[PDB]
Amino acid sequence: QHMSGSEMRPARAKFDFKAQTLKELPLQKGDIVYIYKQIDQNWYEGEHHGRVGIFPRTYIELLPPAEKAQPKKLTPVQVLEYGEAIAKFNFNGDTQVEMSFRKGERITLLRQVDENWYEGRIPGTSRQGIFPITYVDVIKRPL
């Protein structure tokens, strides 16, 4: 609400730095530090090993780049699957709203118009149309 206290950023120590004063704290190559406040353009301040001090920004890397694609693991939720179906009988429509298919093509279930009618499309979205359920066979209902 106040809009103050920006979040710190993870910085990586490019090299090791020896503390010369109490304000300055020691840093070792590879040591990760968090910059909660920038002392100056040439000096940065952050926390390391539970300690706080200052060091030349030229010795650390502010939020280093990520070479990993970052798969973000996975989750059982936030998922979806399209339904599958196959025509039971050859079908030859004569209208744009009505598509055509043979007695062996796969169909993607989208939704049910009413009870005996539904909308579907061929994988890849090549064709789309409506037709009676009694003329198609379902393989897997949508979740």
From Swiss-Prot:
The modification Phosphothreonine is found at residue 75. Detected in skeletal muscle (at protein level). Widely expressed with highest levels in heart and skeletal muscle. It is found in: Cell junction, Adherens junction; Cell membrane; Cytoplasm, Cytoskeleton; Cell junction, Focal adhesion. It comes from the Eukaryota. O-glycosylated. Residues 6-65, 80-141 form the SH3 domain. Plays a role in tyrosine phosphorylation of CBL by linking CBL to the insulin receptor. Required for insulin-stimulated glucose transport. Involved in formation of actin stress fibers and focal adhesions. Interacts (via third SH3 domain) with the Ten-1 ICD form of TENM1; the interaction induces the translocation of SORBS1 to the nucleus. Interacts with INSM1. Interacts with the long isoform of AFDN and with VCL. AFDN and VCL bind to SORBS1 in a competitive manner and do not form a ternary complex. Interacts with ABL1, CBL, CBLB and INPPL1/SHIP2 through the third SH3 domain. Interaction with ABL1 occurs only after insulin stimulation while this has no effect on the interaction with INPPL1. Interacts with the insulin receptor but dissociates from it following insulin stimulation. This is Sorbin and SH3 domain-containing protein 1. It comes from Homo sapiens (Human). The gene is SORBS1. The chain holds residues 791 to 930 of 1292 of the full protein.
